[PDB]
Symmetry: D2
């Protein structure tokens, strides 16, 4: 039953004051309030939850906030109480992240509505259909990449998706698509043996004898699999974990790490800070 | 290099504003801000870190904050950058929590100075001395419980300690001393899944798969009152009773250490009969 | 591709020898091997996995193991490689544990087959039907408790279920049913405030200010909610968790704790040891 | 009050039988038994705890084991009930791992005796003396790397140490000394989400990592690589500046080294090709 207000701007004196004084004048009751000023990047970040007053003027509240935010170079986002982001999940053949996200959605852990599942293969259509989520198979003609991506983007625009989740979508995103999805597409990949580009990175992990397998959830930008880190995690493994078992634990940590990231994002907790994230 | 300001007051529209607007008027540069408004207890809590301005008038800041607060019924605490709380640790025969606290103090993980170890027994004297910390053995005469507690309170006062840690001190505090220490005395005890002679032996027989510990502030309710931190340690069938007791010590050490850390970092607030930890 | 062999007997010299020597003679290749001798209870426990030989005489292997076990008073259980326990899940109105178990079943985390969902209410039928699992609503007539339980027990018998999971089934089991289900029915309940019998235990935990909420999975016997502990766990909570949030964390820890217990049981890991369990 | 027997040999039908039937014939009462057959390396590993019989012939047990093992190519180690490994800790200027190891030893958590602290610098002498442990400062003459290592290796032999712990010892060991300490020297270093060169924590700060980690391993010719015993990580966030990351770095180095030393001294670690099995 609370509104969420996120704000960010160049560090200066009065950055908490300008949000806090305006919220008081507007008779908005602060239920909780978290903020961070990064002394290296020079950026200020604030998350505030509040209970609206009766006769709440949303339009005039935004406009009055836009006015005061000008002096600070401040940008803000305001999210209503019942807000459920519309999401598009992109999938290839691996169904583990898709299954986990839809399960967490269904039990009410992730307060989002998945409006489509988009794929380069037809394989996961039965899974999407069982969940009653519209499924789209846009096969790639290698000669025409922009054509495949226009169809993907068309679904994202037609459904009004405000977040795209890459749940082990294996087709490489063009640089034009990456710019188009900037700041609202979350990807997940494993983080085994940093700096090993072999086709069997889990067999390589087994042979090296690691005692952990890892994963990173990040925002998409032009750097392949890099770009802003949202969440990282590891799963304990041991000698009795053969390659298939290691692959299996990898799927677990991908699942968990992606869900955490997606949760942080939809809860309005994640901010971009130069090339990294603050999570409040 | 940063000051810490904590505020606690009844919930009202503009409780954040009173602190933040004041901080802004005083040219105190805020580096981070955490707050919580408890809708059940009707209390608002805020913890703020800030960098002082050049030529910071500390008396004028405190004075200017006390005037703004009277209108809100607000209680604040302002802690300077280099502040290290003076601490008295009370012990009986068990050394696990004292060892763990003095170790964490020595390596810089708990920013405090242990000015005294007080005990109702002589046994841990050598340990306190090896660490070069004054040790006080105030024996109990069962007739004169107020007499022993008078000596304990003298040391706490003379050393000027602002925190008392009961690191498995096994003599019951009186209602009078409990009142005196309300809000700045931290105790640790075990938490199992039992009530009698051998609690760990009863855990073993019941077949529990965890042992736990609770750190809390002291009040008149024995081993209850305001909870600061709780934790558990995984155990299995291979843990015999003595292994169980050993794990119990580990989790008492870790949980107490956490709670002491929260307290000295100015993160704990009393909220009716519980705590908020920011 | 491995057989599972579990044995237990009164403590004596040569308890590991009698199983290990017999596995050698039978040309059963041990892949891994765990044992424990409880010095307080006087009980020995062994779990062994092996690869069978070509032309594996299962009947005569059991018979010859039965023969040698006599001197030790040893009981054993032998599980074929591909074995998937048939399971009946019992439910009332809380759907969180049922959703969790069926999700974990479907993704292959729990190698079991749920052959029925049995209920004292009609509410969770749609959830069972969506998974294509037969559902049974056996309403209770307070005058005829043995009548409701005969129907439950009939379903368990007819489906050939070898494990029953009480996934927040709230109807009290009779002592007759408890004896009947002894050693193969697993229950889950919260472990909030030991020895507080009030109707709102999570509101009581809130007011008292706990920083953890807990759960216990146990085998069913005549002692209500007590009886052999298989698994216990806790979830961190804090001051910002109101009662409903705490109740929600309770569900999480009930889900995880039950699933670990059920996993231990179906992997042939759990032994009864006097009034407690050994998990190898 | 229990003996510990570890064995490893090539994988064959009857590897468990040879140890267990022997233990039985010798009236060794088995209290706990864990084994693993690695189907990729072709090696079998077993760790058994047992209670000795009255009037236990230790020479006759070891001898009779050695005879049965001949037909299996089997290596075994038998540790007496109250055995406390003699340990040498090597250190440079960083005191976090040394502090943590000496604290854990003093409180009974690591059942070992630190017989010596050896260093390439004099800085941590007071720390070792406070614990009443012999401290040795052997400065490096860069023209005589064999000269410094001869004095280090002397202390290790004279003290009779069976474990060397490199507690952030920063001098590069020679292939000769590495070869010498194979399977009984444990080293600790950091592991990141992976940053070549100057200021790895500053690089990790800029990259926005959300964990820092560490790796305890046995020492061989490959620098900061060689058989991994234990790994762990510590959660970090945006509020951790570079020097906060360094502090967390230290924490996880401490925890990870202590776990690995613990596994080693409890006879739970086995070499398995270029890896470890931890039972």
């Amino acid at each position: 039953d609370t509104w969420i207000l996120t704000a960010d701007c160049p560090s200066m004196l009065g950055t908490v004051d300008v949000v806090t004084r305006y919220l008081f004048e507007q008779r908005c009751y602060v239920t909780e309030h978290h903020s961070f000023d990064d002394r290296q990047s020079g950026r200020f970040f604030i998350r505030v939850e509040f209970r609206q007053p009766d006769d709440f003027d949303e339009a005039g509240f935004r406009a009055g906030l836009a006015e005061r935010s000008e002096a600070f170079g401040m940008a803000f986002e305001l999210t209503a109480p019942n807000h459920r982001p519309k999401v598009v999940i992109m999938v290839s053949k691996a169904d583990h992240c898709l299954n986990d996200l839809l399960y967490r959605q269904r039990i009410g852990q992730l307060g989002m509505d998945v409006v489509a599942v988009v794929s380069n293969h037809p394989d996961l259509e039965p899974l999407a259909h069982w969940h009653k989520i519209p499924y789209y198979h846009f096969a790639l003609d290698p000669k025409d990449k922009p054509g495949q991506e226009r169809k993907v983007l068309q679904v994202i625009e037609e459904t009004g998706a405000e977040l795209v989740i890459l749940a082990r979508y294996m087709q490489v995103l063009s640089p034009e698509l990456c710019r188009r999805l900037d700041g609202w597409a979350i990807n997940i990949h494993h983080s085994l043996l940093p700096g090993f580009k072999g086709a069997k990175p889990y067999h390589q992990a087994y042979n090296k004898g690691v005692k952990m397998v890892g994963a990173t959830a990040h925002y998409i930008n032009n750097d392949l699999d890099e770009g802003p880190i949202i969440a990282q995690g590891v799963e304990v493994v041991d000698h009795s974990h053969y390659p298939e078992d290691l692959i299996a634990k990898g799927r677990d940590i991908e699942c968990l790490t992606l869900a955490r990231a997606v949760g942080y994002h939809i809860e309005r907790r994640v901010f971009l800070n130069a090339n990294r994230t603050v999570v409040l």
